[PDB]
Amino acid sequence: KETAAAKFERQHMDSSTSAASSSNYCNQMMKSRNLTKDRCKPVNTFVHESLADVQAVCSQKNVACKNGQTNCYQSYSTMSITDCRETGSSKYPNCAYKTTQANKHIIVACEGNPYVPVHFDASV
């Protein structure tokens, strides 16, 4: 199994690029991060900032999660992100994604010691 923290890193972190490199970015990343294995994960966001900067969000603006949980945090600053969403004729195992680049505040839920992100809630 995966720890919640490692799963967040696998699904949501891409510090290797400043932004999506092409229209094919989500197709490549959704596959290589193993998010199309058992099904097409419908929606998923990658953050193009350092892991340290994203972990730091857990000490930023405490806000409610979409489901009412109280352990969500919004980044004080905007961050480079890419939204990946199933589109077109996406049918498992032929998964297909729309790549949408943006600069937005991220909202994550945090847990544990160290207190680190364990769920991507939304971006604003």
Catalytic residue among 14, 119, 120, 121: 119
The resolution in angstroms reads: 2.0
Residues 6+ apart with CB under 8 A from 108: 8, 54, 57, 58, 72, 73, 117, 118, 119, 120, 121
User: What range does the domain containing 58 cover?
Assistant: 1-124
* CATH code, domain with 90: 3.10.130.10
Technique that determined the structure: X-ray
Q: How many CB atoms lie within 10 A of CB 87?
A: 11
Distance, CA of 13 to CA of 23 (rounded, Å)? 18
105 annotated active-site:
no
CA dihedral in degrees (101, 99, 65, 7; nearest 10)?
-110
DSSP 14-79: -TT-SS--STTHHHHHHHHTTSSSSS--SEEEEE-S-HHHHHGGGGSEEE--TTS-S-EEE-SS-E
What does DSSP say about strands 106-111 and 116-123: parallel, antiparallel, or unpaired?
Answer: antiparallel
Domain count across the chain: 1
Cα three-residue angle 15-12-59, rounded to 5 degrees: 85
Please check if 66 is assigned to a binding site: yes
H-helix or E-strand spanning residue 120: strand 116-123
12 is catalytic: yes
- Neighbouring-strand partners of residue 28: none
Q: Is 44 annotated as a binding residue?
A: yes
